[PDB]
């Protein structure tokens, strides 16, 4: 029974990963073929830039604004900056904007979404000058609606590019997200790659490679059939036509009986999907963002993401039929993502309850080999030798993602003690259960029989695995001491911060 479980788990992971790699390679070939026909000095689509921020550090906000100003695209109608401020602290962010751009910071009294006239002309008067707006704190969706209205004011605008207050773009991060929109008439949304620059801590180092794998592999295969599930927060381009149609059933979102205050990018992509439109992902557009360093904050972020995932999965399954044959792969991916967590949980429970050293060692070695292959592919693709650190990510997935996913279902399906134990008690219980299972397996199997071949195999395998993880951690420590793990962007940003 254990052999069946291990073999089925290994195949069910590796075969699907290989298929995703093949589909992503085909998508990359198609994108390169499309790009090869682009004439030199191409500027046809008129784009509007929308940035939404809320209490961002002045240094990163200034860097983001300057990088946006550094774009090589020559057809930009207007820059729109929306701030959830109007108290006092965000006046400093407005001052940073005034340092980077013109002195045009409007102070509307009410949000456009709640206004009786959802028109941009109410608060805006010029369509050619960059505008910064301070609005009452209502969330990111409400601020994005104002940006959409302001971009829809101009009848010559053909597309919008959405950037976060922290994302730092490259010199050609706008030209690459707006070309696929003009390649196929059925494409109405383009997704851009997101990278992590503050790869100093171990957790950030693992999260960077997780992002790389979930962008290059997970979304390229989806974009081969032009059915990208999530466009993405840091970078993303949309057509004004589809936005003028989907922006109405997007601010009044309801799930069971309450408004939604999380996501704001996955549902927007899903609404495009339900209308039969096509969405692509370009790997040639790069946007740099940061990742949380503390483990608890990362767990909170993961559970917040899973909260929206557990609804939009059914929402996308209810509309996958409209696309046609393309969508069978989408439903298969949805079922794979649903069943993978259950398979992992069941396998862990089965190998923990039955304290057998052979099965545990075989599972550990099989998982190590699978993650080694996965990290090797990423190292080959990214030309970076640090991608092998991804072999450690399994630990995170067993200590920061599974409890977060469990909490995301146990709290959504339904003083300070309730505010703190509502998001961390399940994680503590999971850690205690894992530790108790380990102690039980060690105590139950407490013997040394070197005359048995299988005991030798189990002990040698576990020792080799410990040596492998130890040398990986030692390499990480040596790299951190030598500052070899620092990204070039982080190396420049540290010097800029020192100079300030």
């Amino acid at each position, epitope marked *: 029974s254990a052999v069946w479980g291990i073999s089925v788990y290994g195949v069910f992971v590796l075969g699907f990963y290989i298929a995703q790699i093949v589909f992503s390679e085909f998508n990359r070939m198609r994108l390169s073929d499309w790009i090869s026909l682009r004439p030199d000095n191409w500027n046809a689509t008129r784009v509007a830039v929308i940035i939404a921020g809320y209490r961002e550090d002045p240094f990163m906000f200034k860097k983001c604004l300057e990088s946006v100003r550094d774009s090589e695209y020559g057809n930009v109608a207007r820059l729109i900056c929306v701030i959830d401020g109007d108290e006092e602290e965000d006046l400093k962010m407005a001052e940073i904007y005034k340092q980077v751009y013109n002195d045009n910071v409007k102070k509307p009294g009410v949000v456009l979404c709640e206004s009786e006239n959802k028109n941009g002309s109410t608060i805006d008067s010029d369509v050619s*000058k960059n505008i910064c707006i301070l609005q009452p704190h209502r969330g990111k969706r409400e601020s994005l609606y104002t940006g959409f209205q302001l971009a829809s004011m101009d009848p010559s605008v053909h597309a919008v590019v959405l950037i976060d207050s922290d994302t730092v773009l490259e010199k050609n991060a706008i030209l690459e997200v707006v070309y696929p929109l003009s390649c196929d008439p059925n494409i109405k949304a383009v997704a851009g790659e997101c990278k992590i620059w503050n790869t100093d801590t171990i957790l950030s180092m693992l999260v960077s490679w997780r992002y790389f794998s979930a962008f290059n592999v997970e979304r390229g295969a989806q974009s081969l059939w032009k059915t990208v599930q999530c466009v993405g927060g840091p970078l993303g381009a949309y057509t004004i036509d589809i936005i003028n149609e989907i922006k109405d059933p997007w601010i009044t979102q309801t799930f069971l009986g309450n408004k939604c205050t999380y996501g704001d990018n996955r549902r927007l992509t899903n609404e495009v999907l339900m209308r039969g439109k096509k969405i692509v992902y370009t790997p040639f557009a790069v946007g740099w963002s940061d990742s949380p360093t503390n483990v608890m904050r990362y767990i909170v972020q993961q559970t917040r993401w899973s909260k929206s995932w557990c609804r939009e999965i059914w929402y996308t399954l209810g509309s996958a039929w409209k696309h046609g044959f393309s969508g069978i792969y989408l439903a298969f991916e949805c079922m794979y993502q649903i069943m993978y967590f259950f398979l992992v949980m069941y396998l862990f429970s089965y190998i923990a309850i039955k304290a057998d050293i052979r099965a545990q060692t075989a599972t550990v070695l099989v998982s190590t080999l699978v993650t080694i292959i996965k990290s090797s592919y990423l190292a080959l693709r990214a030309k970076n030798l640090k991608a092998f650190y991804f072999v450690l990510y399994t630990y995170v997935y067993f200590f920061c993602m599974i409890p977060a996913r469990i909490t995301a279902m146990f709290t959504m399906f339904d003083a300070r003690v309730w505010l703190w134990a509502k998001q961390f008690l399940i994680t503590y219980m999971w850690w205690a259960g894992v530790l108790a299972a380990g102690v039980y397996s060690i105590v139950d199997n407490w013997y040394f029989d070197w005359a048995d071949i299988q005991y030798r195999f189990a002990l040698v395998g576990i020792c080799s695995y410990l040596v492998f993880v130890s040398i990986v951690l030692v390499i990480y420590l040596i790299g951190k001491i030598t500052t070899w793990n620092y990204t070039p962007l982080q190396k420049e940003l540290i010097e800029e911060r020192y100079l300030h």
Partner: nanobody
Amino acid sequence: QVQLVESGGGLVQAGGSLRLACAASGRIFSSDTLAWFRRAPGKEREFVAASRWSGGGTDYKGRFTFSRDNTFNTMCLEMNSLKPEDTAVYYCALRTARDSYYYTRNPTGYDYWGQGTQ
């Protein structure tokens, strides 16, 4: 914030090829439009050529050529088949994108100016 210094120019016969180099100290952000303005004696500033730092090009001609180093924050404008009426004072101007992204040929829009030559 940015300082523009232009060098070159002089008394030259009708047959020749001048070369004026304008160097900017500061940051150009790869989005400002750099232009040349002509001021003949007894006349006013008139548009000659302009170009974005990233790329583009808009003359007037077919005889003038615009070049940008894009590495040392300096750029060059050359002349071919000079005319007796072409002699004037040349000014190097820069237009930032802080106010608007629209392209204009009006010298009033440009905010940074340098000392004239020739």
